[PDB]
A paper describes a structure:
Mutations in leucine-rich repeat kinase 2 (LRRK2) are one of the most common drivers of the familial form of Parkinson’s disease (PD) (1–3) and are also associated with increased risk for the sporadic form of PD. LRRK2 is a large, 2527-residue multidomain protein. Its N-terminal half is composed of armadillo (ARM), ankyrin (ANK), and leucine-rich (LRR) repeat domains, while its C-terminal half contains two catalytic domains, a guanosine triphosphatase (GTPase) (Ras of complex or ROC) and a Ser/Thr kinase, as well as two architectural domains, a C-terminal of ROC (COR) between the GTPase and the kinase and a WD40 domain at the end. We present cryo-EM structures of LRRK2RCKW, WT, and carrying the PD-linked mutations G2019S and I2020T, bound to the LRRK2-specific type I inhibitor MLi-2 or the broad-spectrum type II inhibitor GZD-824.
We observed an inactive conformation with DYG “out”, αC “out”, a broken R-spine, and a disordered activation loop in the presence of GZD-824. The binding of GZD-824 to the ATP-binding pocket was shifted away from the hinge region relative to MLi-2; its pyrazolopyridine group partially overlapped with the location of the pyrimidine and indazole groups of MLi-2, with the rest of the molecule extending toward and past the αC helix. As expected from a larger inhibitor, the binding pocket for GZD-824 was enlarged by the DYG-out movement and opening of the allosteric back pocket, involving all the main components of the kinase’s active site. While the G-loop was in an extended conformation in LRRK2RCKW(G2019S):MLi-2, it was sharply bent in LRRK2RCKW(G2019S):GZD-824, with F1890 interacting with the pyrazolopyridine group in GZD-824. In turn, Y2018 from the DYG motif interacted with F1890. Here, however, the cryo-EM map for LRRK2RCKW(G2019S):GZD-824 could accommodate two rotamers for H1998, while WT showed density for a single rotamer. G2019S can accommodate two rotamers for H1998 (B), and the model in (I) shows H1998 in its “down” rotamer, which places it away from the inhibitor’s binding site. The presence of an alternative rotamer in G2019S could result in weaker binding of GZD-824 to this mutant. This prediction is consistent with a study showing that GZD-824 inhibits LRRK2(WT) in an in vitro phosphorylation assay with an IC50 ~4-fold lower than that for LRRK2(G2019S). The G-loop adopted slightly different conformations in our LRRK2RCKW(WT):GZD-824 and LRRK2RCKW(G2019S):GZD-824 structures and this could, in principle, have an effect on H1998, which is close to the G-loop in its “up” rotamer.
Residue numbers in the entry:
A (entry chain A): 1335 to 1354, 1370 to 1378, 1388 to 1395, 1399 to 1402, 1413 to 1437, 1441 to 1469, 1480 to 1488, 1498 to 1509, ...
B (entry chain B): 43 to 126, 128 to 155
Amino acid sequence: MKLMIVGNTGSGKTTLLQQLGIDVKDWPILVLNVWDFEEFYALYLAVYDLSKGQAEVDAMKPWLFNRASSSPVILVGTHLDVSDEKQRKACMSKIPAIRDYHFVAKLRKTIINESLLEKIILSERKNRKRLLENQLQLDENELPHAVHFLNESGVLLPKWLCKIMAQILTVRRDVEKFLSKKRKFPKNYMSQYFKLLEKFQIALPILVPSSLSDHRPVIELPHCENSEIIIRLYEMPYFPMGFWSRLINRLLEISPYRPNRMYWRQGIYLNWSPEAYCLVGSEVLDNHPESFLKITVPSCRKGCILLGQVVDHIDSLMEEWFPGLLLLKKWALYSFNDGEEHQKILLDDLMKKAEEGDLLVNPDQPRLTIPISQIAPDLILADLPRNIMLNNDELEFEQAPEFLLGDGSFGSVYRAAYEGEEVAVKIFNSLRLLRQELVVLCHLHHPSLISLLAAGIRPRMLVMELASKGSLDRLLQQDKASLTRTLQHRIALHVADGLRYLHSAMIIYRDLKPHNVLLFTLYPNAAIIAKIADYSIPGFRAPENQQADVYSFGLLLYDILTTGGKLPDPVKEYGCAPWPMVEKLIKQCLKENPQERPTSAQVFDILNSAELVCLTRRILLPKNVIVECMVATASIWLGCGHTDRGQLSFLDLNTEGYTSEEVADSRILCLALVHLPVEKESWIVSGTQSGTLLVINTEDGKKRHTLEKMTDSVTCLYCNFLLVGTADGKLAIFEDKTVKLKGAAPLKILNIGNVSTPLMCLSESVMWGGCGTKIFSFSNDFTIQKLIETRTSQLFSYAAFSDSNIITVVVDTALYIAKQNSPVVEVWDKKTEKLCGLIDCVHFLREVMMSYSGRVKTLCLQKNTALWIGTGGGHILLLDLSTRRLIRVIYNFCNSVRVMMTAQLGSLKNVMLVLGYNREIQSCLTVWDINLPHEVQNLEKHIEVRKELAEKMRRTS
Amino acid sequence: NATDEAGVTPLHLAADSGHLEIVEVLLKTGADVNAWDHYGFTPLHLAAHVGHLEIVEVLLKAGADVNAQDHAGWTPLHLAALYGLEIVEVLLKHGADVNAQDMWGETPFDLA
Ligand SMILES: Cc1ccc(C(=O)Nc2ccc(CN3CCN(C)CC3)c(C(F)(F)F)c2)cc1C#Cc1cnc2[nH]ncc2c1
């Protein structure tokens, strides 16, 4: 237990301590750490001087008002030898909770009586906290429990306290050099200087609340008559100590739509232009030994708004810091005629009257009355924005449990109509709750925040947009069929864009859950789908702040990826479709360490990417497996060349059941599929380094054979006829019916080049292909139609790239050809046999964010004029063929790209399969939605339109 | 000397084409022997890639460094061994590092 000594100034606390900032000492008895008491304010010892009698006893109540958990307090009067008996009797008459009284070794015995691996740490450490030598069990993991233990015991933090901290009371520009920059104050602690003062009520983001005096300066008001000034006096028995520092702190963010700011220890005077000002000084009334915090405001519109803001701040301080006063009594002054003495009423009256009407009828002069808004313009919300007061002639409202909205799950909210349109009405059965909620709502204008349409007075209601489609919770539970992937991403994006807005406004939004997500439409391309709400009426929260919000949003994103359901993997647990880059984001937000969770801006930035939406799968093959080619059947066949003998791999795109088998004595470089509907069969042909074309039945692996061997390495295969391109510049044409025959000879052998010029690519639009530096075309008779020599491309580009091997060719209207170890893709006109275009991958990669190579490794094409280009690094350039513009640069998934091609899944969904390398070496398969460029453009337009709308609502308010 | 739209100097082009006379005259007049384009290729990089031995020799005599790394991290030894090894021998006679690694961790004798 801790013994702490407090009392009035000069009461003799240290004198008692000898007879038994805030300096701390050790006192054994039950060994107690004793503090000698200001800033930021066990067993309590209340010390007062008896020489002033009850005059010293009074004003002690703040000591009971101020962080105790109902701990005992001991009251002692000192200097009894110099006090009078009548003063002591007054002290008796006067007398959180006091246990016993004394008036001076009785004090020490009273203290002893009232004071009457197990955390064995902070002994060597007191005289980075892990292992100072691991104490206890892993040093309690440095959990907040240990921090609270060390702070409460007063052993670690108070080294600088009362010696360096809190010395500015008598001692941030021109401030640090005298307070915390004397001898040894490293620049590592600039962020803590003049910031730890803020938490301790010592400095304010304006200032030490001690240079102020208790002498009120001269105050002059532009208005003087009773009928033109609203005066509010909250009276509190005591002004619970520490009140004025916090009040001076908060009364800065006050706006009528701070030219002059005077202040002292008890009082501030804020002055804008005339008919806009507020005096919040503290007045002393004769024969009233209480504190009178008085507010004097002009009666105009800006006066009403300013008084409302000041009162809101004061009751906010009451609710947040000094709950004990909520006793404090509020009054308002009035005068029926000018010159009459100001008369006062408690606020419950004029509240009943604002409910009943808008006039204060004089009891004796029935014809003489005052409107309420002229007396206290907060009971009638005369502070509402001009477009927010309810027009009772435009509201069709039925208050019955038949049009109840959400069946009351949203609180007391009913369906209604406002200005014709269908609308929602929340009926407030206190005025404090309504005013607080209005203050919060009037400063929140963003697309994902529920918009406020009206705020009534006589009903005392709120009226807001009717989400026609219910909340997100009902979407998740009832109509699961309409929850498409695009809609899920839009909902999550919309919630994050607005959680980050609340965090920008320094608003916590403690509990975020699906119930607080309101849906206006289910059409994915809409501008507004989901907003966030708080009806003010649990498994969706952090283990315990913005990190709690990020954890809540991670749970919400988990419950969006999953339709509905430490925390298990969503795909394995619920069988939902995989969604990479959202599973990772869920894992990131759900980190148990608050400092490792991403901030809401980072979360939204992660969600704002089309790589996140159209990345269907990302499969990592076993480590040290190197595969060079694939063919899609869904299922994928891969050619493993990680050793001197090629192997055949099979990957099931639904189960991820990778398997492999040694099939050839040489490395496999090319694969293809021969389909024979006429027999209803299919073969897989493997072209290896030795030149062996080895054929497998996909239905049963035992049926295997081999065609006629070529004279050199087989470089490419295509499939009706089978075309085989070898490394010695030869093309072998087989009939597909001959593939099933062991040792079958090709239908034709055609020589394109020589041994040093290998034929490497074959594609359809008339057959087209590439060998060495030449492009060749064929008719249906398998004869040469044209040869285009591409070494003239050396007249452009550079000879290092142009004079190389052709690795892939695609053609719809132009020849898009890529070379070996070249970042330049050349575009040839197949009708004129002349080079007409260049595409530089380095040029594209430089415009977008040392870890890049840019050498083209593969190409692929879509019917929607789209060209996919894989670079040597882990980059895919998506381009529009209309103008060869850059649609997107996919990157930051792996380190290298090997080959990609289009495919169709078993669900008839078109995807793009990209095989690359994580260069120790781990080959990777990536699955993209075939419509990725369109999603990129659509989401860019969606973000642009939504940002434009957000700016519009921010400007218009 | 000036760079083109791809950052390529006349010395880069001469190294690509293998012109002994142009490389020699540019080095004699004071061309930047270690200038690089957006690809990170130095004169010696291009000479090793294309396969010109005498260009490599005249560049090394003019002060070309054998430890330059391009955008892909490939030293002139990498481009010399990748395309075949007289140029490898000439570069190794100079103080070249055979343990240099590119972005994928490959030494230039692994490319051969
Ligand atoms: C009828 C009604 C009244 C009020 C609100 C409201 O939310 N107000 C409100 C207040 C404060 C804040 C900000 N925070 C909150 C967390 N605080 C901790 C920090 C500050 C927010 C927000 F969070 F939004 F910013 C919203 C919504 C509705 C509604 C509705 C409705 C409409 N349409 C529907 N259809 N089916 C059902 C249904 C229901």
